[PDB]
């Protein structure tokens, strides 16, 4: 089997991407944030505290003839941005782009933090990291990809995120029309539960490539590109007036600037992030200070190849017995 679904930016900045997902019988369609940096499929639901729902579409398990309470199971998750959610668990039928999994753990939110409430466009998350990170207790649950893997034509999914435009998540096949050149594959460590790999270096604009190993995660659920402070300083030094602002929370730059590109290495190959992808617009409405799309990871503990980087590539998440990542230009 295969599946193919369009993913759409939630706003004009590509702050996140939503993909429609069918849950239950009859289908209830919710727009979920596919997140290769976590491993829980959770949804706003009829059980979510009413004051914490503000425009999201909810899953109502009592209206699904295939929903079953997973007795005793609870979940609770906290994300790198400080947001969180928690609740109980049902199993139900879940379909993405024509690919159907029966018995998928659907984690029903009883509580969500303010950032989720405040984002009316995201009805939940669909985790695509390794199932060892799944938070369901006392019986850890498998991700949608893990449950589908054996049925797929090939044990892979691909992320093809658009810049200010829709893109595609495919399951079970590699669309050879969706990229240019060849796909370069690189090793993955699953030791932290992430799609963790080592970039071979970087360049700023037309500058010379610096060969240096940068360990980080391919994370579709993180908006920006978070890299070591040395790398980020080298980037922003090429932008007149750019500075790191403690009050704003990162590097800002004059909105009048033209940003240079940023290149990252994948083995001997190179992925080029155009400068425009690094512009996240005014820090507040009407400001001439703009927020940068490349930020320091120094306070995180891990480097994160978020959407800013991944949207410049066609990315293969290869879930073979030894997982690997592939990147192609497009």
- Contact criterion met (CB below 8 Å) for 35 and 221: yes
* Sequential DSSP letters for 10-60: SSTT---EEEEEEETTTTEEEEEEEETT---EEE-BTTS-GGG-SS---B-
CA 97-103-135 angle, 5° bins: 95
Q: Is 269 helix (H, G, I), strand (E, B) or coil?
A: strand
Residue 196 CB burial class (10 angstroms; 0-12, 13-18, ≥19): buried
| Residues 37 and 145 grouped into a single domain | yes
- Contact criterion met (CB below 8 Å) for 166 and 6: yes
| Residues 204 and 62 grouped into a single domain | no
Spatial CB neighbours of 39, under 8 Å, sequence gap ≥ 6:
127, 128, 129, 130, 131, 132, 133, 134, 135, 143, 193
| Residues 170 and 201 grouped into a single domain | no
Last residue of a domain, one of 158, 174, 190: 174
Told to judge if 206 belongs to the known catalytic residues of this protein, a careful annotator would answer no
Work out the number of other CB atoms within 10 angstroms of the CB of residue 301.
7
| Residues 190 and 322 grouped into a single domain | yes
- Contact criterion met (CB below 8 Å) for 156 and 21: no
Q: What is the resolution of this structure in A?
A: 1.2
- The boundaries of the domain holding residue 218 are 175-330
CATH code (residue 100): 2.40.70.10
Last residue of a domain, one of 174, 191, 221: 174
Which pair of tokens denotes residue 96?
């993405």
Experimental technique behind these coordinates? X-ray
Last residue of a domain, one of 135, 152, 174: 174
| Residues 157 and 97 grouped into a single domain | yes
- Name the active-site residue from 35, 40, 92, 146: 35
| Residues 153 and 281 grouped into a single domain | no
Spatial CB neighbours of 108, under 8 Å, sequence gap ≥ 6:
42, 43, 45, 46, 47, 48, 59, 61, 87, 88, 89, 90
Which pair of tokens denotes residue 28?
């209830």
- Name the active-site residue from 39, 95, 108, 199: 199
Told to judge if 261 belongs to the known catalytic residues of this protein, a careful annotator would answer no
User: What CA–CA distance (Å, rounded) separates 294 from 280?
Assistant: 10
**CB under 8 Å, gap of 24 or more: what pairs does 281-289 form?**
281/12, 281/13, 281/255, 282/255, 283/248, 283/252, 287/255, 288/254, 288/255, 288/256, 289/245, 289/248, 289/252, 289/253, 289/254, 289/255
Please tell me the total count of domains within the chain. 2
* Entry field: residues in the chain: 330
| Residues 304 and 327 grouped into a single domain | yes
| Residues 39 and 127 grouped into a single domain | yes
| Residues 66 and 157 grouped into a single domain | yes
- Contact criterion met (CB below 8 Å) for 111 and 5: no
């Amino acid at each position: 089997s295969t599946g193919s679904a369009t993913t759409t930016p939630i706003d004009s900045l590509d702050d996140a991407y939503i993909t429609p997902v069918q849950i239950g019988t009859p289908a209830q369609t919710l727009n979920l944030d596919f997140d290769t940096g976590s491993s829980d499929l959770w949804v706003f639901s009829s059980e979510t505290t009413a004051s914490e729902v503000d425009g999201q579409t909810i899953y109502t398990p009592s209206k699904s003839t295939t929903a079953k309470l997973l007795s005793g199971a609870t979940w609770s998750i906290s994300y790198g941005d400080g947001s969180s959610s928690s609740g109980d668990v049902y199993t139900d039928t879940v379909s993405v782009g024509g690919l159907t999994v029966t018995g998928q753990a659907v984690e029903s939110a009883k509580k969500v933090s303010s950032s989720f409430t405040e984002d009316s466009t995201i009805d939940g998350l669909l985790g695509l990291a390794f199932s060892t990170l799944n938070t369901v207790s006392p019986t850890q649950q498998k991700t949608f990809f893990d449950n589908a893997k054996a049925s797929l034509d090939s044990p892979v999914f691909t992320a093809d995120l658009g810049y200010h435009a829709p893109g595609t998540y495919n399951f079970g096949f590699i669309d050879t029309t969706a990229y240019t050149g060849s796909i370069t594959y690189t090793a993955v460590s699953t030791k932290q539960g992430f799609w963790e790999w080592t970039s071979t270096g970087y360049a700023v604009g037309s500058g010379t490539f610096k060969s240096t190993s940068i360990d980080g995660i391919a994370d579709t659920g993180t908006t920006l590109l978070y890299l070591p402070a040395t790398v980020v300083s080298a980037y922003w030094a090429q932008v007149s007036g750019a500075k790191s602002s403690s009050s704003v929370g990162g590097y800002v730059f004059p909105c009048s600037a033209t940003l240079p590109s940023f290149t990252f290495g994948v083995g001997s190959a190179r992925i080029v992030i155009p400068g425009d992808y690094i512009d996240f617009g005014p820090i507040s409405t009407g400001s001439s200070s703009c927020f940068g799309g490349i930020q320091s990871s120094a306070g995180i503990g891990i480097n994160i190849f978020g959407d800013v980087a991944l949207k410049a590539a066609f990315v293969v998440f290869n879930g073979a017995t030894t997982p690997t990542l592939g990147f192609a230009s497009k």
